[PDB]
């Protein structure tokens, strides 16, 4: 349908004290590819990121309306946003459009600013927030991204085991998607620091 125009994939897995999010770099129109540098992950502020997929028109449009509400929320508050608070914000933005709804599946991942706690969540076209204790993925290949993270995920994983798990889940699942590929950007959100890496992937 319309969600299959630009394709795309977004993956977020929860570790022990840290959380990792990953999405591919590909941007294309149906059978026509465009560019390799496309970015599906935008910063929400410290230790909080959001993934986006589906029609890229709404990907870039909702990202501006989320940054519309993000900055206004951060300027009014004296404290940073919690990842659980942002989940409900995306639910209101998608529900007010209920007649005209946007086409996208936002994926929110980050750490609880309280102390170390990781938090993950994802929504749907209808704007239904959902909290899972393992991982969240979205895209046209999301049926493929399940089986990788279903078996590989563990209750507690250090940044060493977390990055190795989410990276292998991306490289294996995205290669079976025709509209997805061309590099994978992986972000590691830890308590002390934040690590960004670009994986070596096939061009196909």
């Amino acid at each position: 349908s319309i969600m299959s125009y630009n394709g795309g994939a977004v993956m977020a897995m929860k570790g022990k004290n840290c959380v990792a999010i990953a999405a591919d770099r590909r941007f294309g129109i149906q059978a026509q590819m465009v560019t390799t540098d496309f970015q599906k992950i935008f910063p929400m502020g410290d230790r909080l990121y959001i993934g986006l997929a589906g029609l890229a028109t709404d990907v870039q449009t909702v990202a501006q309306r989320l940054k519309f509400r993000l900055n206004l929320y951060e300027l009014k508050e004296g404290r940073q946003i919690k990842p659980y608070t942002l989940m409900s914000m995306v639910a209101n933005l998608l529900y007010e459009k209920r007649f005209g709804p946007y086409y996208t599946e936002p994926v929110i991942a980050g750490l609880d600013p309280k102390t170390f706690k990781p938090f993950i969540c994802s929504l749907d076209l209808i704007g239904c927030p959902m909290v899972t204790d393992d991982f969240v993925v979205s895209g046209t290949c999301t049926e493929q991204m399940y089986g990788m993270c279903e078996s590989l995920w563990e209750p507690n994983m250090d940044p060493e085991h977390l990055f190795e798990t989410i990276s292998q889940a991306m490289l294996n699942a995205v290669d079976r998607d025709a509209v997805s590929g061309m590099g994978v950007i992986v972000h590691i959100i830890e308590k002390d620091k934040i690590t960004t890496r670009t994986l070596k992937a096939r061009m196909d």
């Binding site: 009014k76 508050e77 004296g78 608070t85 409900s88 914000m89 209101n92």
Partner: protein, 226 residues
């Protein structure tokens, strides 16, 4: 549709100036933030025995963890009640969480601003005193009809509010338990109030880890024993 509030030759607002003078002569109200809780003790005076005390209550909760008292006009307060409660509603609609006291007082004080500009309407005649509990830290705020909201550890409002502030300035300090916060709030209330003090004359309520709750006349009588 023309604004009733204009700038004086001295720059002050004339309309809000009488609004602050109106809340200065209202019912005496005091509050104290000490330790893990905040004590709210107000004055409900009835002119006759025919009056039913259970029908009308001056201390009203905004939500579970937030409560509010007032000194000023009766009718303008109920308008604040409906809009502030509806604001907490519309808050819980969007954010699906209990509202922080700082954000609650901010957008409610903005409603007080709207009638210092929009025409054909008078400003509010009520000065709100807000109590709230969020993230384990108690909140005591004070708002007036001008729209500017402040924060206080302890304060006084209503008739003879200057004395209540000076009394808490001397008597009240840090390291007071909630039990001492009630008994200190009663002592500062004995000064402003005149006459015999019963459980019906005073309406007391508190907010703590369990949320904002109003005190029953039975336990108030226990605190009337000093």
């Amino acid at each position: 549709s023309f604004s009733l509030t204009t700038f004086s030759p001295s720059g002050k607002l004339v309309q809000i100036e009488y609004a602050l003078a109106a809340v200065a002569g209202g019912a005496p109200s005091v509050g104290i933030k000490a330790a893990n809780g905040v004590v709210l003790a107000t004055e409900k005076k009835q002119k006759s025995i025919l009056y039913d005390e259970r029908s009308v209550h001056k201390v009203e909760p905004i939500t579970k963890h937030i409560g509010l008292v007032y000194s000023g006009m009766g009718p303008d307060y109920r308008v604040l009640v409906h809009r502030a409660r509806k604001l907490a509603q519309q808050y819980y609609l969007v954010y699906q969480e209990p509202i922080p006291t700082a954000q609650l007082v901010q957008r409610v004080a903005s409603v007080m601003q709207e009638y210092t500009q929009s025409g054909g309407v008078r400003p509010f005649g009520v000065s709100l005193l807000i109590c709230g509990w969020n993230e384990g830290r108690p909140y005591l705020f004070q708002s007036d009809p001008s729209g500017a909201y402040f924060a206080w550890k302890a304060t006084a409002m209503g008739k003879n509010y200057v004395n209540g502030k000076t009394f808490l300035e001397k008597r009240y300090n840090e390291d007071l338990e909630l039990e001492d916060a009630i008994h200190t709030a009663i002592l500062t209330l004995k000064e402003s109030f005149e006459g015999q003090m019963t459980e019906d004359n005073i309406e007391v309520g508190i907010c703590n880890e369990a949320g904002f709750r109003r005190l029953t006349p039975t336990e108030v009588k226990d605190y009337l024993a000093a």
